[PDB]
Design a protein around this ligand. Structure first.
Ligand SMILES: *[C@H](NCC(=O)O)c1c(COP(=O)(O)O)cnc(C)c1O
Ligand SMILES: *[C@H](NCC(=O)O)c1c(COP(=O)(O)O)cnc(C)c1O
Ligand SMILES: *Cc1c(COP(=O)(O)O)cnc(C)c1O
Ligand SMILES: *Cc1c(COP(=O)(O)O)cnc(C)c1O
Ligand SMILES: [Ca+2]
Ligand SMILES: [Ca+2]
Ligand SMILES: [Ca+2]
Ligand SMILES: [Ca+2]
Ligand SMILES: [Ca+2]
Ligand SMILES: [Ca+2]
Lengths: 331, 331, 331, 331
């Protein structure tokens, strides 16, 4: 019904499913799928990069990204709450033999460069070998400052460190900046793009970067099990998504901001609104009862002291207004 | 438009496509996709197993299968020419920290148990820990003797070893046996099922085993990158294929044996002659040219001193007759 | 000839040397070395543990300790500045496939349990599996409060977590506590003991724990490369040191606090003041020159903005007085 | 008493222990130990290599050698019965993420190059990336043909593959060839040297090779836990061993050959004699009883259908004659 748990729940639109059914395909392992190739060349050109690769999930996109950047024994500085450190079951370490070096992100979602600098290991056999700095744009909805993005870029060049950006929700930051994707991707060596969240595809993600870089990524994609066959049927949804579902993300943002106020006037404690995300401190009491009370009207959220509500193309404001009524009535 | 490179090139049928678009989906990460669940239960019920899991590729199906069976430092005995040892870039060792103990398969495609026994490491700190015997049913078209299957199952039990079967083309074996899937699946703790080859799906594989075993498989799938969202659309295909594309596999088999005689009468040296696979001894660089001659006539093959012709539903006898005609030509 | 770089520079004493040469050996791989066995039993009996194992280094002692405790994909919480996370080139992750979850230690050198609890991963497929809490007693000279030790032990049990203590200098802590080793060892499932630092051995460390735990440690030691032969000669040293070099550690402590006052009265900015370690705030490149000034006078230190002076049995108060004299000089 | 189990049991001679007690030492981590350095420069110059490194065991020497040659995902072609594949608990794979590719050695102990060639993986994302070829000279006593050694050398250069030689018993082959060590080490990029077997040191091994190569080896030695402190006391035994215990290995060889005949005339079935090794097929009956019968007179061998007797400096011919009497009497 009304799912406010994540934007990963968005479903294929009629026009999308059709484009998926009319897509010409080929064996992607042999690199013969027209659609996959098409989706990749497009992504690479829109971002100003040389190559791109389609993957099953964003989790594999990041695992492959990390393996491509870091050899056995190297490390990547990242956030304590970042997806490719916290939410990917420790894969970079467990499977990739890469040393992780996490640090608390600043309140704004960036990684203080002064702190990043303190974590850069001296070239001594006691330490892992620092090699990469991984960011996450839209970090829990948070849009990273553009001045920071430029600064992280310069800093890594000065330290001869790669810079990767987990862009599961990069177009959300993009619509928010009001600029072209290229303007922000010029500040990284590689980044991912998820198609199965706000952009609304059934499955799919992209890793983009330098030609040689992507070349190595291919070997890892195969090893990890991401080398599909006629995956052009999926890449097709991605293309339709990047050409029709980007601008409208501003609608999710406006709704999140609308809901935030409604909830305010409803009595709910609104902690933070950012892009398609809002946070309500519901408390330990009313928490569980909240999930149950909402689940009854077919309203699905992740019960918790602090609830994270996420808006997407499959949730209108009218539906939000209704959810609001139910929240105001929960009191 | 005639592809004999592999059965992985098969494209969706009209029927399949409509079944895919007409399918209900949901976030599989939450287990909310009814189609993924139905595919998994149908597979499980069909082979007499408790549980099944959907994966992007057979490569990830095996890596996950091996990870779920072998702990860090444990070992698996497998064939020098088996897919999960030779054709998966050594993932089990590279990513999973599992020692591989490969041995040559006999001519019938099985692993001589006397050799397997000689490879079981004593419980001594010099050795890895033999944990699993992995087999591959349909091995390069070869169908393992049902007698051996039983022997291997009994052998492992007696030696407290787990048994896994890579069934990328197990249905080709089933059809060749003339029995039910469960009659052969009974001799393995876990087995894999590829839907993207002969069954004609665009993507996907299944790993089938005990409930606890499969539960571990789920964590590994996630870490490896295969935890997709709306896999329903993809699962839908697998459904249609398992109910409508198994039996016809007989047609591919007949075509392979039909073509063997065509190429024989032509002048080619047909070496082997199994299910949907055909092996011809072309000889050096009279083959790298064959790939040219055939490519020119819109006939796609995998040029090599020993060519491997693979049949499937996207190749007909009429087209096969054309290849035999074109083949005999340059001779 | 005055080394304050570390207590790892200590050289064998006359007494120690004769004990080494006068020792009976045998192939430890077969457990045939009476001296290795006696060292291992003495350590075990002394700390109230079932078993102990001899290792080449403390680095291998920890890597093995972590491997024996954590399976592939499991995780350990540790301090951002702990040896087995920061000073061992990330081995636990790189070689053992264990996810590291580091956190900043409080000023007293402990890991705030509230922070540790916040890091325990829920049993969800996105997360690694929190298995162990690793501590480091004597942390850079700091002696952890006995109260905390008990707290950590209780905390872990309640949360079903294992507890390991890196005791490279645990005897420095013991002497500082004024209690018996077993009175602090009781609050950990496993702990390590370095014999090559303050105790004055040329090489070696011990890992102490349960019999089953240590049994696993033995396989890992072998694979890691520490299964030596006639380790008896080396074990002999450890024996002598544990019975003749523990108590004197008080002398190093007094010298450190004596020197703190010497350098204070001189003009240096003594920052910290713990067991056999001393920290001075030198300031940038007025330090890279200090290393020159001192090196010139046969005084070996580890030049740095924040110098770390370490005392041991191969440095006397007389020599310390000389350094204080030479230090005040260039000021 | 009379140990014929292995040559690893040899004990330090009086002159050796003394050289160990008089050796000047330093912290090897800082690279200040005079003796270690001395032992390394000597080994490197005698073999015609640029650098050398001392390690705790030969097992770590090989693990480090493999990690230094192969990055995550690469492979090494080696023997099914080779030490760094079979007797090192699968470390190259388990800890190093290196794919192992074993093949049966020819009867003479070499690895047929024609078979090595068939195992070299094409540069395709399906395969691990072949990088190294590892040999073992003196393989179970067997001295590898010199023409073969030269051939393997050329072959690897033609295929751009590294060539490593596990020389745990290299000086045994050397004394047997009648040439200088350099003449055989010129045919490899790197090799190990064990000091704790025929050469008779308590502990110790060496990895030798190119400067850059050894440099990387150091990082791995630290990670694995082989970076010791005042290990000059051990390296000292090595030096005394390479300058006094090499020539006399011809005495072990002569004795092995003497024993082989005695046992012949005694009634024992002598299968093979090679350097300091002899093999007797004792059978499944008389096997266990043999170990017990011998263990009674203080004669230690490894009971088995086929017994491997190893001679060393701690076993005279007179002792062998006595062992022979006991074997002849066992009938
Ligand atoms: C996925 N979204 C989680 C959520 O519900 O907020 C995600 C990914 C990878 O997605 P997956 O399909 O592999 O699970 C990568 N990075 C971030 C920051 C998120 O948020
Ligand atoms: C050791 N010798 C075993 C025997 O008893 O024959 C060995 C080594 C490594 O020695 P370790 O001290 O690490 O165990 C490496 N390579 C070979 C061929 C042997 O044989
Ligand atoms: C094709 C194949 C695989 C891998 O399948 P993907 O889905 O392409 O990764 C594994 N095993 C066998 C025996 C195969 O034929
Ligand atoms: C010195 C030290 C180690 C490592 O010791 P090695 O024997 O040199 O590897 C580990 N932990 C601490 C806390 C140390 O001070
Ligand atoms: Ca979606
Ligand atoms: Ca297909
Ligand atoms: Ca590994
Ligand atoms: Ca010392
Ligand atoms: Ca690893
Ligand atoms: Ca010895």
């Amino acid at each position: 019904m009304i799912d406010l748990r994540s934007d990963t729940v968005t479903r294929p639109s009629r026009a999308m499913l059709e484009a998926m059914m009319a897509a010409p395909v080929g064996d992607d392992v042999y690199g013969d799928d027209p659609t996959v190739n098409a989706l990749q060349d497009y992504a690479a050109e829109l971002s100003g990069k040389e190559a791109a690769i389609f993957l099953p999930t964003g989790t594999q996109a990041n695992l492959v990204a990390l393996l491509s950047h870091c050899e056995r024994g190297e490390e990547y500085i990242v956030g304590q709450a970042a997806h490719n450190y916290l939410f990917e079951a420790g894969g970079a370490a467990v499977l990739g033999s890469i040393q992780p070096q996490p640090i608390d992100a600043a309140a704004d979602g960036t990684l203080p460069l002064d702190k990043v600098a303190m974590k850069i290991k001296p070239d001594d056999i006691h330490f892992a070998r620092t090699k990469l700095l991984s960011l996450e744009n839209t970090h829990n909805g948070k849009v990273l400052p553009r001045e920071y993005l430029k600064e992280a870029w310069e800093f890594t060049r000065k330290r001869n460190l790669a810079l990767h950006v987990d862009g599961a929700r990069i177009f959300n930051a993009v619509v928010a900046y009001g600029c072209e994707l290229k303007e922000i991707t010029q500040y990284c060596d590689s980044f991912t793009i998820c198609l199965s969240k706000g952009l609304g595809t059934p499955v799919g993600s992209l890793l983009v970067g330098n030609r040689d870089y992507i070349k190595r990524a291919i070997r890892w994609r195969k090893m990890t099990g991401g080398g599909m066959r006629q995956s052009g049927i999926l890449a097709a949804a991605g293309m339709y998504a990047l050409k029709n579902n980007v601008a409208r993300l501003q609608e999710d943002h406006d709704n999140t901001a609308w809901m935030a106020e409604q909830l305010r006037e409803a009595g709910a404690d609104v902690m933070r609104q950012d892009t398609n995300m809002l946070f309500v401190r519901v408390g330990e009491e009313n928490a569980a009862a909240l999930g149950e009370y909402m689940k009854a009207r077919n309203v699905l959220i992740n019960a918790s002291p602090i609830v994270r509500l996420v808006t997407h193309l499959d949730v209108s404001r009218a539906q939000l207004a209704e959810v609001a009524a139910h929240w105001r009535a929960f009191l």
